[PDB]
Design a protein around this ligand. Structure first.
Ligand SMILES: [Mg+2]
Ligand SMILES: [Mg+2]
Lengths: 251, 308, 245, 101
RNA sequence: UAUAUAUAUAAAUUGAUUAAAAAUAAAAUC
């Protein structure tokens, strides 16, 4: 058996009662408004748990199963606030023990359904600068630093490249106040990593010649475009690549 | 590609690769994918529906089938091999941008690439279907990333109305403080949990009528001056950048803020390096996805046989 | 100690400085007398071999004191993770062959034509000591791996190289010698893998690919360590070395 | 009933079984290889804990008989390598298949 | 350097009287 199942919230919510004929509302919209909470004149939803980003280096990921759909807290005191029959937000009768007892792994789990998905730790700027100094200045290999800091070699090389690019951008004053704010904010939203031959002929060039020929040695029977090769231009297996300029070319 | 149509419908409840408020609610209320009481074909169809709604929705079905790779890569807990069903889409440039938190959604990443705001190893790339190889460096224009991650820039009229309300509320607070400073100080300290000059320091603010002030931005900029908001209209400190100018994060950013395992990101420069293709290891899969392993298993079974 | 002393009947382990001086005197007499009789250095060395072999049997039980029992005795602290006791036991109950032969040459030069009494005391102390065979060297290498002591590993590889020159090693067959050398090389590879010096381990593996057959069992730890850091080039090189077959 | 499972994911070897007119040919599979079998066999493997399998059903395709034959084949048409080694008086290394490149 | 702003009135397309929706779909804004 299978049928269309409108994705109503799995948790309890306040369904529509008798409606004035012109409301033209839906239970889904009411559930969305209950999850969102009241909206400000500025357009914000301060009541919601997740409206504002975290700053304690611990992510704030949705936990609909643990909180049973109650996603409204006081913006300042950060204490739970449930809808009441009078229509106001107020303290809950009994506080959910599940929300105090949260496993450390689940805090790094972005999506409630998938446990295997987890966020990655963000390296501190000091560690990146230390890696830059260790590699470029002290001449250490990527293997030794990767073993030293519990890191992987491709990540070490990427860190080297990124720190070099950051140094260049800081040289040109390209990093701006807004960019600094954005970097700082996204830094505090994530957990922080803890350290502990073929012959070649280059041709003669003459004035006025716009190009120079390059001749590569090759072996007969292996060099050339084959005769009768399959044509995939009109097939779903058509082969596409990108030029050195970056344009798209059929291969 | 497909035309974006009802990507955030609450009734259908599909989850998309996006930071939408409606997408957030759809993800929040979903719970899990219900596979009980369904035949094998129905289970496979539901799994395909959900996973393709999230993974590569903008791709056409036949194009995804051609791009689909029946093989999977991996490198004590059980390794989730079949979460790698959609790992092939992760090397695409737009997907890399989205996973690097340089775009609010894969569609916005596609638009950023198509409009010439993205570079890969220093050469401009204008094709979202471009595929990255390990070690490839890509970067985005900083203004585009700030717009994608920053809050929306208000218009002059809306921000003027917000400033009217702000001036009004400041005047109300000033009146309350001046009339009864005792209870105001008591409330302030209680919320945190005397000198009469404090209430003298507070100053009223001239109420503003927008009918005469409309159409002239510098006049309003000079007239509006609040202790936090000095000499600019709400959200328009410098009305020439494409975002809410006093830069604050877009709303509902924390639910989707996920740091990838296969990309290394430098947000100061809006640069990133594609370390590797996502792989599956014991107890973890580097393919970010909101669906559990059985859903990907059923989608893989569907796409092995083309829905046969 | 109770077993060494045959239940206390032999007072070999109990020692005194008076006994030390008197034994040094007696053995100086015996050896500096012996120095002249022998036809050549080889014959004097043979006399010293017989002397030490008979002395050790006279002083300590032959059956109880041997390679196997000493191996277990020294293996105790390694499992118990006590380096000081292991080193004390190793020094006290084991003698290195090359040092002994060097002492024989030195005493030959001294007699035929404070250090002298030290050499005499060495020859006297041989009654408490067993020659360090290849298995005991491998055991000390295992102790180096367990304790993560670079100094011990360096000293052990020096002593192993010197022991290779000594006659007891060359007495054995070529195949046994190759097997023991391969075991030592694998132990060194494991040591460098634990120390994190993967470059040194791959260097050892590559340098001796032809003379030693490298299997995946020996390099499994190295492969795991290299995969954990994702050094695909080194992994490919090592796998090519092992699996070229 | 408990069923033998090789590496907790698949059957130990190829199984050719006969049940009341249903011929089951079930082949083991590599890690990551999904369940590619009759839907009844797919559900039975899902409940049993078998993750990797291939197979084909010949002659009768009755769902009830397929299910009973699948259970009985898992129970009698299967033997652990430990059992084989102990019965033949050999070590597990002697009965493991050697790799050929 | 305040900030869960709160009150009013007015309206509110198709279906329906609540798990019956169309529908964030429109408009509008950037
Ligand atoms: Mg149907
Ligand atoms: Mg009507």
């Amino acid at each position: 058996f299978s049928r269309r199942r409108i994705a109503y919230p799995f948790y309890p919510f306040k369904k529509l009662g008798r409606q004035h004929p012109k409301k033209h509302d839906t239970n889904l919209k009411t559930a969305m408004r209950q999850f969102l909470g009241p909206k400000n004149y500025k357009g914000e939803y301060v009541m919601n748990k997740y409206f504002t980003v975290p700053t304690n280096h611990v992510p704030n990921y949705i936990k609909p199963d643990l909180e049973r759909g109650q996603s409204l807290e006081h913006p300042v005191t950060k204490k739970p606030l449930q809808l009441r029959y009078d229509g106001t937000l107020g303290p809950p009768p009994v506080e959910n023990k599940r929300l105090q007892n949260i496993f450390k792994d689940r805090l790094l789990q972005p999506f409630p359904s998938n446990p295997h998905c987890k966020t990655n730790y963000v390296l501190s700027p000091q560690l990146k600068q230390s890696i830059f100094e260790e590699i470029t200045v002290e001449g250490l290999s990527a293997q030794q630093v990767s073993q030293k800091y519990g890191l992987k070699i491709p990540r070490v090389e990427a860190i080297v490249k990124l720190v070099s690019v950051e140094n260049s951008w800081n040289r040109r004053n390209r990093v701006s106040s807004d960019l600094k704010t954005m970097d700082e904010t996204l830094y505090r939203m994530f957990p922080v990593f803890d350290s502990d031959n073929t012959k070649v002929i280059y041709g003669e060039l003459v004035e006025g010649e716009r190009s120079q020929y390059k001749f590569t040695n090759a072996k007969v029977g292996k060099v050339g475009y084959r005769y009768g090769s399959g044509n995939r231009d009109n097939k779903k297996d058509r082969r596409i690549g990108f030029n050195k300029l970056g344009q798209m070319v059929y291969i | 590609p497909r035309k974006a149509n009802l990507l955030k419908s609450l009734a259908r409840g599909r989850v998309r690769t996006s930071f939408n408020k409606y997408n957030l609610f759809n993800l929040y209320k979903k719970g899990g994918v219900d596979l009980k009481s369904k035949s094998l074909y129905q289970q496979k169809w539901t799994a395909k529906q959900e996973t393709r709604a999230y993974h590569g929705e903008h791709l056409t079905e036949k194009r995804w089938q051609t791009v689909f790779k029946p093989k999977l890569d991996s490198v004590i807990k059980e390794t989730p091999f079949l979460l790698q069903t959609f790992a092939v889409l992760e090397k695409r440039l737009d997907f890399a941008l989205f996973r690097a938190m340089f775009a609010s959604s894969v569609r916005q990443a596609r638009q950023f690439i198509l409009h010439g705001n993205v570079r890969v190893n220093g050469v401009k790339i204008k094709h979202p279907s471009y595929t990255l190889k390990p070690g490839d460096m890509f970067s985005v224009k900083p203004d585009k990333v700030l717009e994608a991650l920053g809050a929306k820039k208000p218009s002059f009229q809306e921000a003027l109305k917000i400033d009217k309300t702000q001036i009004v509320l400041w005047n109300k607070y000033v009146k309350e403080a001046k009339t009864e400073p005792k209870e105001v100080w008591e409330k302030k300290l209680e919320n945190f949990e005397f000198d009469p000059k404090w209430a003298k320091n507070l100053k009223y603010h001239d109420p503003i009528k927008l009918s005469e002030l409309e159409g002239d931005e510098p006049k309003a900029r000079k007239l509006i001056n609040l202790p936090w908001q000095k000499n600019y209209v709400y959200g328009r400190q410098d009305p020439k950048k494409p975002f809410f100018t006093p830069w604050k994060p877009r709303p509902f950013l924390s639910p989707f803020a996920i740091l990838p395992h296969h990309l290394e990101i430098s947000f100061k420069t809006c640069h990133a390096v594609y370390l590797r293709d996502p792989v599956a290891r014991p107890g973890q899969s580097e393919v970010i996805s909101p669906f559990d392993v059985p859903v990907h298993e059923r989608a893989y079974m569907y796409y092995l046989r083309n829905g046969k | 100690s109770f077993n060494m002393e045959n239940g206390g009947t032999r007072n070999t382990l109990t020692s005194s400085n008076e006994a030390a001086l008197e034994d040094i005197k007696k053995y100086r007499q015996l050896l500096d007398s012996f120095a002249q009789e022998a036809e050549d250095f080889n014959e004097f060395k043979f006399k010293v071999m017989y002397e030490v072999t008979k002395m050790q049997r006279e002083s300590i039980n032959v059956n109880v004191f041997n390679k196997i029992s000493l191996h277990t005795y020294l293996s105790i602290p390694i499992n118990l993770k006590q380096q000081k006791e292991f080193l004390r036991r190793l020094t006290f109950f084991t003698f290195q062959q090359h040092e002994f032969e060097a002492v024989i040459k030195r005493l030959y030069e001294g007699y035929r034509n404070n250090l002298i009494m030290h050499d005499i005391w060495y020859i006297t102390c041989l009654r408490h000591k067993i020659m360090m065979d290849t298995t005991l060297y491998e055991l000390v290498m295992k102790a180096a791996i367990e304790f993560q002591n670079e100094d011990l590993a360096k000293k052990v590889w020096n002593d192993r190289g010197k022991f290779r020159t000594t006659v007891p090693f060359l007495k054995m067959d070529q195949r046994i010698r190759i097997a023991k050398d391969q075991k030592f090389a694998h132990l060194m590879v494991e040591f460098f893998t634990k120390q994190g010096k993967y470059s040194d381990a791959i260097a050892i593996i590559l340098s001796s690919k032809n003379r030693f057959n490298w299997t995946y069992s020996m390099v499994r730890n190295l492969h795991k360590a290299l995969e954990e850091i994702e050094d695909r080039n080194s992994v490919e090189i090592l796998l090519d070395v092992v699996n070229k077959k | 009933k408990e069923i033998p499972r090789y590496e907790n994911r698949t059957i130990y070897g190829d199984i050719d079984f006969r049940y009341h007119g249903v011929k089951l040919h079930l082949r083991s599979a590599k890690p990551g290889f999904g369940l590619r079998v009759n839907h009844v066999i797919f559900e039975i493997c899902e409940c049993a804990g078998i993750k990797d399998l291939s197979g084909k059903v010949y002659k009768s395709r009755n769902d009830m008989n397929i299910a009973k034959g699948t259970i009985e084949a898992f129970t009698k048409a299967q033997k652990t390598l430990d059992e084989v080694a102990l019965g033949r008086g050999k070590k597990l290394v002697d009965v493991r298949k050697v790799y050929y490149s």
